[PDB]
Amino acid sequence: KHGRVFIIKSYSEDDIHRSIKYNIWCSTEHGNKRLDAAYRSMNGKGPVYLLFSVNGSGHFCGVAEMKSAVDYNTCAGVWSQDKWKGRFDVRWIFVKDVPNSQLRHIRLENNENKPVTNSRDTQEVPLEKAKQVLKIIASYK
Ligand SMILES: [Cl-]
Numbered sequence: 001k002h003g004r005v006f007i008i009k010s011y012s013e014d015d016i017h018r019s020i021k022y023n024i025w026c027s028t029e030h031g032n033k034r035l036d037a038a039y040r041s042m043n044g045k046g047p048v049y050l051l052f053s054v055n056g057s058g059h060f061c062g063v064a065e066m067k068s069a070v071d072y073n074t075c076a077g078v079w080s081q082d083k084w085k086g087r088f089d090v091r092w093i094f095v096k097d098v099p100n101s102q103l104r105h106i107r108l109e110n111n112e113n114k115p116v117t118n119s120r121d122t123q124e125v126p127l128e129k130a131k132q133v134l135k136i137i138a139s140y141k
Helices: 013-022 029-042 127-139
Strands: 004-010 048-054 059-066 088-099
Touching: 004 013, 004 029, 004 127, 013 048, 013 059, 013 088, 029 048, 029 088, 048 127, 059 127, 088 127
Parallel strands: 004 048
Antiparallel strands: 048 059, 059 088
């Protein structure tokens, strides 16, 4: 495809549940700006996919598509913590726990060849490594 794919790291499993319930997410300022630029410059040509993992959990927990630009002025305090400013919409595609052992072989040439499972929040994944990750997530039993 023409997709672009980002890792999402959360310190809050509660915020993930809320995001699956209401189809919204929010990253840092720096993270919002990264995802905003990628979504807008995409013009609707392809999908922005988001690969979610909770920090320390040892597993990825699903896949969602970014479904709107970033709105930086929205209701405060909707998450577990107050630090988040803004909102954007998502559509969750897969909601399943996939152990990091299933993905650790995939390394990112744009991240000093580190395993994809050792990425920080909003790390971008090269397209062919991303299609690798998505195949494993979709097919995992
Ligand atoms: Cl690429």
